[PDB]
Every structure is written in C-alpha cells, then in structure tokens.
Design a protein around this ligand. Structure first.
Ligand SMILES: O[C@@H]1[C@@H](O)[C@H](O[C@@H]2CO[C@@H](O)[C@H](O)[C@H]2O)OC[C@H]1O
Length: 295
C-alpha cells in the first residue's frame, strides 16, 4: 500500500514549470538558474506542484557506461529537495534529450543507464517526487518504440522504486485531432500526460473556437482517463502566442478551470523570460493577473 495516482493528482492541483533551467544545454545558459527562494515564492503564490525539466545529455558520458556527472546529480538533488521540503509534488524527467529519438536502437541503452542512475539516486525520496520518463515522447519515433521505451524505463525504475508514481505520455492533441494510448503498461502507479502536438508544423490563439476545441479534447481525454482508470496530467499548458494581453489572461483562466473541473492535474509553462513567463526571477514578483486566473 502506497499513495495511488488518483490521490496524487488531486494533491498536485495547479502547479508551475521551472522552465528553461535544468533542461537548457547547461544550467544558466538560458534562463536564470535555480535558486532556493524560487520555491518560497512559488509556495507563497499557491502552486501545489513543480515540474523540473532536465536535459541529461551534457552531464552524462557519451560512451559506455554513460555515467552521469556526480556533480550534476548532486545539483538536481539539491533542487529537488528544495521543492520537496516545501511540500510541492515535484516532477523530474528527461527533457530535450532528443539524441534518443535520432537513433532509438543506438541510444536506448544510454537512456536506460541514465534512468538507472536517476532511479537509484532518488529511490528514497518522498512519494511526492514523481518520475516522468520523457517530456514529449510523440514525434520522430515510432509508436512501437515509444511503447518499448516506457516498458523498459518503467521496469528499470521499479527495481529500486516499487511504488513511486511514474508519468508516461497518454497522448496529445492539436486543433484537428486527439490521440490517446491504448497500450498502457500494467502498473498501479501511473499517471498519463498530454501535451499539444502537431505533426505538421511545416492565426494566434485565444479565440472562441479554440476554447471549444480544448473542451472537446479535455472531454475525450477525460473519457480515456475514466476508461483506463488512469489520472491525467497536463504538464505544460499555455505554450502559445496570444493576440493580446486580455486574451492571454482569459486563456489561463479558461484552461485551468476546465482541467481542474475534470479532475486533471496540471503545471503551467513558465520559461522565466521577460516570452511566456509568469514569475520574474530577478524581481521575485509574479504577473498577479495571471496567478489569479489560475486560482
Ligand atoms: O525559449 C524557448 C522555450 O520556451 C522552449 O520551451 C518549449 C515550449 O513548449 C513546451 O511544450 C516545451 O516543453 C518547452 O521546452 O524551448 C526552447 C527555448 O529556446
């Protein structure tokens, strides 16, 4: 007996991303690196969870045995503990580690070793630390390889983390269609996550129709959720350009109302740039209007 996915999702509520930080090529190379006070402010702001993207590529050896720099693991643990110590449901993953998609067969072992070491190093963390296998799994990889990856990375995790909730891609959506996974691993500690995906990238968001599209997507995902008995998590919503200020505020308010109503847990995307940012890391102030739209 441990905490179950549905209980975890209800607990996660609305949260935030620590974007363009640990998933940049090197911490700091993009947005300001992680500072402990970030978490004090997130807490004071109402966030109930913090997703922490991480790109392991440049901190892991490029050749066998694919060891992760101890120094980097220490760094991620420091940031995780700041989050966990403040009561946040904390999520860590693999983000922008595209090398794995560029050659699945050739790089899957390095990906396993990476996950092997992560699971090991955090095996004793609170139940509130969740393992998200890979940020946006859909794309330049086959549906079979995606399924193979989840099964094997999940199996690695389970050896040292028997009951820790793992997050895997449940599907994605766009203005034309929604895709959901039918092939779900047989595990009692999984949460499904969906992101906006468009296989044909080759307007501006915020309209009426756009909202009708999302409510549609959300209802289908919800049906998926009830049918497969698996909670839902929108790990990075509101990653779009809007026609104007008033439209942006409206979208955050809408999206979060619709998700929380259907019992979905979610994290807003915040790249810390002042440009899809809600929290200013230099002034330690939030875009109050948006924060109120989320809660
Ligand atoms: O500044 C850019 C970031 O905003 C960008 O972050 C992507 C935004 O969409 C989300 O779905 C992705 O997860 C997130 O990585 O990355 C590139 C950077 O230059």
């Amino acid at each position: 007996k441990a905490v179950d996915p549905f209980e975890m999702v209800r607990k996660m509520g609305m949260g935030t991303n620590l974007g363009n930080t640990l998933e940049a090529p090197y911490e700091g190379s993009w947005s300001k690196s992680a500072m402990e006070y970030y978490f004090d402010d997130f807490k004071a702001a109402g966030y109930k969870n913090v997703r922490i993207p991480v790109r392991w590529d440049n901190h892991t050896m490029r050749t066998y045995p694919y060891t992760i720099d101890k120094a980097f693991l220490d760094r991620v643990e420091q940031v995780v503990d700041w989050s966990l110590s403040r009561g946040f449901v904390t999520i860590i993953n693999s983000h922008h580690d595209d090398w794995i998609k560029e050659d699945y067969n050739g790089n899957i072992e390095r990906f396993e070793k990476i996950w092997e070491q992560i699971a090991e190093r955090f095996k004793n963390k609170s139940e509130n630390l969740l393992f998200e296998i890979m940020n946006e799994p859909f794309g330049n990889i086959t549906d079979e390889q995606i399924d193979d990856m989840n099964s094997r990375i999940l199996k690695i995790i389970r050896k040292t983390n028997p009951t820790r909730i793992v997050i895997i891609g449940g599907g994605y959506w766009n203005s034309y269609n929604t895709l959901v996974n039918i092939k779900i691993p047989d595990d009692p500690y999984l949460i499904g996550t969906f992101h906006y995906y468009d296989p044909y990238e080759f307007g501006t968001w915020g309209t009426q129709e756009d909202m009708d599209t999302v409510v549609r997507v959300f209802d289908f995902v919800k049906s998926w959720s009830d049918r497969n008995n698996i909670p839902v998590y929108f790990g990075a919503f509101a990653v779009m350009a809007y026609a104007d200020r008033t439209s942006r505020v409206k979208w955050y308010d809408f999206i979060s109302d619709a998700a929380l109503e259907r019992g979905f847990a979610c994290s807003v995307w915040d790249n810390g740039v002042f440009d899809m940012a809600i929290y200013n890391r230099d002034t330690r102030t939030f875009d109050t209007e948006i924060l109120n739209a989320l809660f």
